[PDB]
Amino acid sequence: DHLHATPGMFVQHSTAIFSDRYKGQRVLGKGSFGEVILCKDKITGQECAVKVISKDKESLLREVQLLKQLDHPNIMKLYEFFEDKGYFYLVGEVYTGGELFDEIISRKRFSEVDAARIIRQVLSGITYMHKNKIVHRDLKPENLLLESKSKDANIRIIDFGLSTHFEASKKMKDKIGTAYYIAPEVLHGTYDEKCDVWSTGVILYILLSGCPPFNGANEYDILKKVEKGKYTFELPQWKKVSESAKDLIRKMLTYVPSMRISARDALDHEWIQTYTKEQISVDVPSLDNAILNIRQFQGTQKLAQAALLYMGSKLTSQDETKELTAIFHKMDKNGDGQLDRAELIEGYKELMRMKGQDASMLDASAVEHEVDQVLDAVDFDKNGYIEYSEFVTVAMDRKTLLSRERLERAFRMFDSDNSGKISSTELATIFGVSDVDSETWKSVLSEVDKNNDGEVDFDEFQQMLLK
Numbered sequence: 001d002h003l004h005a006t007p008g009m010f011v012q013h014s015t016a017i018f019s020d021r022y023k024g025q026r027v028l029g030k031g032s033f034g035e036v037i038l039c040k041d042k043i044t045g046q047e048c049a050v051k052v053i054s055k056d057k058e059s060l061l062r063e064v065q066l067l068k069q070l071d072h073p074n075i076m077k078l079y080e081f082f083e084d085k086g087y088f089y090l091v092g093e094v095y096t097g098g099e100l101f102d103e104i105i106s107r108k109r110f111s112e113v114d115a116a117r118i119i120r121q122v123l124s125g126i127t128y129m130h131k132n133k134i135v136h137r138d139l140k141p142e143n144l145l146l147e148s149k150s151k152d153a154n155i156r157i158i159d160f161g162l163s164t165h166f167e168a169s170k171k172m173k174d175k176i177g178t179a180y181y182i183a184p185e186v187l188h189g190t191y192d193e194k195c196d197v198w199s200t201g202v203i204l205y206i207l208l209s210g211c212p213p214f215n216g217a218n219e220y221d222i223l224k225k226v227e228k229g230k231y232t233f234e235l236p237q238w239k240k241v242s243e244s245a246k247d248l249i250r251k252m253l254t255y256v257p258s259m260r261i262s263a264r265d266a267l268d269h270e271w272i273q274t275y276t277k278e279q280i281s282v283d284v285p286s287l288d289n290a291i292l293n294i295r296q297f298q299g300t301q302k303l304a305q306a307a308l309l310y311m312g313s314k315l316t317s318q319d320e321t322k323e324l325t326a327i328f329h330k331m332d333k334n335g336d337g338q339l340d341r342a343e344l345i346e347g348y349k350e351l352m353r354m355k356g357q358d359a360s361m362l363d364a365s366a367v368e369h370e371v372d373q374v375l376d377a378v379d380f381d382k383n384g385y386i387e388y389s390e391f392v393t394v395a396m397d398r399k400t401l402l403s404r405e406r407l408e409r410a411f412r413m414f415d416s417d418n419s420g421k422i423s424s425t426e427l428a429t430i431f432g433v434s435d436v437d438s439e440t441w442k443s444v445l446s447e448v449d450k451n452n453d454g455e456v457d458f459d460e461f462q463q464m465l466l467k
C-alpha cells in the first residue's frame with residue numbers, strides 16, 4: 001500500500017488520446033518509413049520520438065513494463081505509452097545522433113580512448129540492468145543510439161524487445177539474439193546475464209578493429225564460429241592496440257560463462273577506469289546550489305512529491321539539465337549510474353573542500369547524519385539509491401522546473417477525469433496503488449486545500465509548488 005514514487009508509474013497513466021497531447025512533425029531515423037516519428041508535446045513544446053505500431057500485443061507490454069523499471073543515464077527514456085483501437089504509440093526521449101552502427105560503418109576504426117568512453121557507458125547501463133535483474137539479450141551497435149550529433153554524445157541503450165527479468169534459481173533458455181553478438185551459451189540454450197557481457201565484448205572488438213570477431217558468409221556460418229568460440233587479434237590489424245584493451249576483450253569473450261567477467265567487474269577494469277584522468281568540471285556555485293536544493297527536500301507531502309518527479313523525470317530535456325547531469329556523474333564515483341550513501345558522503349566532502357571549509361570543524365559523523373536525512377527524503381522509491389531522475393528532480397532550481405507549461409502538463413496528468421480538481425483516488429491511481437491512506441490525503445489537504453472541498457484545483461496545485 002506504500003506510496004513510493006518512480007518515473008515508471010507515469011508512463012501508462014494518461015486518460016487522454018495521443019493526438020490530444022502530441023503533434024507529429026517529421027519521420028525520424030533511418031528505418032522503415034513512418035514507424036518512428038518526431039513529435040512536439042502540444043503543451044510543453046518538448047520534442048519526442050514516437051514509435052507507432054498498427055495492431056505482438058503481449059510482448060510490447062512486457063517491453064514497456066521493463067523500461068518503466070529502468071532509470072539510467074545510458075538507458076532510453078520512455079515518456080508515455082498509448083493504445084488506440086488500431087495503434088500503439090511509444091513516446092520516448094529523442095536521440096538525434098543515429099545508431100552507433102552508422103558511426104562504425106563510416107570510419108576505419110575507433111581509437112582506444114574513443115572506444116573506452118562508449119563501452120564505459122554501455123557497461124554502466126548493463127551493470128545497472130543486471131543489478132535490477134534485467135538482461136537485455138540484444139546488445140549491438142544498432143541498439144545503441146547517440147544522444148546528439150555532437151562528438152561528445154552520450155550513448156543510449158534502446159530496443160528492449162528481447163529483454164527479460166532473470167533469476168539465480170532458474171536459468172534462461174530462449175535461443176535469442178543477433179548472430180555477430182550472441183553468446184555461445186545462448187545457442188546451447190542454457191545461460192545467464194553474462195550473455196550481455198559477451199555481446200558487449202563483441203561490440204568492443206568491432207570498435208577497435210572495424211571487423212566482427214566471428215564472421216562468415218551467412219547466419220548459419222556465423223553461428224558455427226560463435227559456437228566454437230575461437231577468435232584472434234590478427235596482425236597487423238591489431239598491432240597498435242594496447243595489451244590492456246586486449247585483456248578486457250579476452251575477459252568479456254571468455255567462453256566459459258562462469259569464468260567470464262561480470263559487467264560490474266568490466267566497468268571496474270583498469271582499461272575502463274584509467275583511459276582518462278580528465279575530471280568533470282563543476283563550479284562551486286552549481287554544486288552548492290544542488291546540495292542546497294537536495295537537503296531542503298525533507299518533509300514534502302505525496303502529491304507534491306509525485307508532481308515534482310513527473311516534471312523532472314518526464315518533462316525536462318538534456319539541454320535544460322546539463323549542469324545537473326555533470327554533477328551527477330562527478331558524484332557517481334563507481335560510474336554505475338546510481339548515487340549510493342558513500343558517494344553522497346564524498347559529494348558533501350567535495351563541496352566543503354571546494355568552498356574552502358574546515359571539515360574537522362564538524363564532528364566525525366556529521367556528514368553521515370546529513371546524508372542519512374537527505375537519503376530518506378530524496379530517495380523517492382525507497383530503493384536505497386538516488387537514481388538520475390530522483391537527483392535531477394530535487395537538485396534542479398525549483399523556479400526553473402516549475403514553468404507554466406510543466407505545471408499545466410503535471411496538473412492535467414493527475415486530473416484524470418478532467419474535473420478541474422485532483423482527488424485522493426486520482427492520487428492513489430497515479431501511484432499505482434488501490435487506496436491512499438486517510439492520513440496521507442489529510443497531510444496534503446492541510447497544506448494545500450485553501451477552500452476546504454477536499455480536492456486540489458489548478459490554483460491550489462500551483463500554490464503548493466510555487467510557495
Ligand SMILES: Nc1ncnc2c1ncn2[C@@H]1O[C@H](COP(=O)(O)OP(=O)(O)NP(=O)(O)O)[C@@H](O)[C@H]1O
Pocket residue numbers: 028029030031032035036049051076092093094095096098099142145158159
Ligand atoms: N528515441 C529515439 N530517438 C531517435 N531515434 C530512434 C529512437 N528510437 C528508435 N529510433 C530509430 O528508429 C529506427 C527504427 O527502429 P524500430 O522502431 O525498431 O523499427 P526498425 O528498426 O525498422 N525494426 P522493427 O521496428 O522491428 O520493424 C531506428 O533507426 C532507431 O534507431
Ligand SMILES: [Ca+2]
Pocket residue numbers: 332333334335336337338339340343
Ligand atoms: Ca554509483
Ligand SMILES: [Ca+2]
Pocket residue numbers: 379380381382383384385386387390
Ligand atoms: Ca531511489
Ligand SMILES: [Ca+2]
Pocket residue numbers: 414415416417418419420421422423426
Ligand atoms: Ca479530477
Ligand SMILES: [Ca+2]
Pocket residue numbers: 448449450451452453454455456457460
Ligand atoms: Ca480545494
